[PDB]
């Protein structure tokens, strides 16, 4: 006899435990190992890849391939807003179904920079400059380019290399932020304005498009796992 007194914690089954176990058929010889291409060892391998953001939404711009394209047109007055959405992945209805956001809905915390690659898919003679600005929370989103400038912006000059990466840096008062909505922490506003209107010659279409891509940086980490809200079931699949 070796005296023991069972501490409370025994005779329970957690849904996140980890222990030794008794085997079923003992001495079973597991099949060999193949080095099948494209091994994954971390979720940040998957999260650092671009995925097209369906920025546009209306009510039927959310059931077609119209969702992913951001309409850009030549408008004579410059200072018109191209798009605008808050940065609050895994809650925002712009990043709720993207690749980054869908990995993010399994986590409660997130930290790190996020890259928004904007790709001009216009004509090959169309030009234009855009002032892509990210204004941290401190006020309720710019409504003019003259206010958007003050934030952290990047003027994108188009003409070869049809993409320009506006990297949103980490500005937060904490070392993590919630994926779910909260008001102790917020993520500010991402807006785009025309810097210099789309100049399109003759015989070239005057309505172009931009694509928005969301990816994670290498200074990115997620912590505290929970389970998604965007999947459901009623009765078991028969």
């Amino acid at each position: 006899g070796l005296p023991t007194m069972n501490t409370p914690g025994s005779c329970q089954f957690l849904t996140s435990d980890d222990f030794q176990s008794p085997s079923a058929m003992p001495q079973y010889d597991v099949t060999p190992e193949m080095r099948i291409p494209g091994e994954v060892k971390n979720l940040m391998e998957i999260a650092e890849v671009d995925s097209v953001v369906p920025v546009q939404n209306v009510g039927e711009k959310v059931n077609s391939m119209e969702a992913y394209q951001i309409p850009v047109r030549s408008n004579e007055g410059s200072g018109t807003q191209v798009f605008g959405f808050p940065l609050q992945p895994g809650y925002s209805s712009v990043f709720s179904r993207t690749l980054l956001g869908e990995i993010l809905n399994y986590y409660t915390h997130w930290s790190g920079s996020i890259k928004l690659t904007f790709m001009f898919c216009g004509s090959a003679m169309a030009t234009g400059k855009f002032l892509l600005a990210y204004s941290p929370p401190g006020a309720g989103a710019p409504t003019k380019r003259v206010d958007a400038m003050l934030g952290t912006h990047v003027i994108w000059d188009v003409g070869l290399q049809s993409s320009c990466v506006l990297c949103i840096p980490w500005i937060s008062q904490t070392h993590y932020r919630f994926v779910a909505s909260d008001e102790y922490t917020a993520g500010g506003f991402i807006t785009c304005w025309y810097q210099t209107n789309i100049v399109v010659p003759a015989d070239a279409q005057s309505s172009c498009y931009i694509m928005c891509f969301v990816s994670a940086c290498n200074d990115f980490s997620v912590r505290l796992l929970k389970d998604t809200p965007f999947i459901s079931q009623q009765n078991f699949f028969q």
Partner: protein, 255 residues
């Protein structure tokens, strides 16, 4: 050497040169090579097709309309007609392949549009009827492009595939297809996509006339658009080449 607009892929007899494009996208980081003895499950002696089943087999061209849904070609079943690849898969039980999927589309500098060229390994398509499986004549090509649709395929007792661009016929958001190796053919600049698929499967070698290990999908994210006049027929031509083919178990002709 100089500009990166140039590329030239020579496999056997056929060469594909392109004046202007971008980089070749190599697999998941692996280039197709022969299967070594520490993975070889077959006990029989494999053949070596070499250069005679590594040429660029030019599949059917399809015409991109101003608004067009998208297309897909299964990979071992688009080459089941062309050349000696179509023979070998039928005389041999097991086969192992890699690919060079090269999608080429040219356009003028007054045209705009943007294709997403992905290669989805193991694309298991849903069905319009929520309790029936697809047919083998709607699901597969014949080296022909099957095209999706922008409206849901109506349900009944039909076994036609569920075809909607935005769900990709798999029930996954179309915008997330970029994980898989791919490239874009933005008509603004960059007129081809080269995607080098290495052999990807759970088993080391598998029958190819019953299992389709890769599915190429070419989905236009920005519709083709231009002004009145000009040309109105910009085709998309697919040239696929097997790479490092290897077969085993020399049976007889079958299905």
């Amino acid at each position: 050497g100089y500009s990166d607009r140039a590329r030239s892929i020579t496999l056997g007899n056929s060469t594909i040169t392109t004046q202007e494009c971008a980089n070749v996208v190599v697999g998941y980081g692996v280039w197709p090579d022969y299967l070594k003895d520490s993975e070889a499950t077959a006990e029989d002696q494999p053949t070596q097709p070499d250069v005679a089943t590594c040429r660029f087999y030019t599949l059917d061209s399809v015409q991109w309309q101003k608004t067009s849904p998208g297309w897909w070609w299964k990979l071992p079943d688009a080459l089941s007609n062309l050349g000696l690849f179509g023979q070998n898969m039928q005389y041999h039980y097991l086969g192992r392949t890699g690919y060079t999927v090269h999608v080429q589309c040219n356009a003028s500098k007054f045209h705009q549009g943007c294709l997403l060229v992905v290669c989805v390994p193991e694309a298991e398509m849903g069905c319009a009827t929520l309790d029936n499986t697809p047919s083998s004549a709607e699901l597969l090509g014949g080296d022909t492009a099957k095209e999706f649709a922008d409206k849901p395929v109506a349900s009944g007792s039909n076994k036609l595939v569920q075809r909607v661009v935005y769900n990709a016929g798999m029930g996954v958001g179309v915008g997330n297809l970029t994980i898989f190796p791919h490239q874009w053919i933005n008509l603004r600049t960059n007129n081809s996509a080269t995607i080098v698929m290495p052999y990807t499967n759970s088993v080391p070698m598998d029958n190819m006339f019953r299992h389709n290990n890769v599915t190429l999908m070419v989905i236009p994210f920005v519709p083709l658009d231009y002004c009145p006049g000009s040309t109105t027929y910009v085709p998309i031509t697919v040239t696929i080449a097997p790479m490092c083919a290897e077969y085993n178990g020399l049976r007889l002709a079958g299905h």
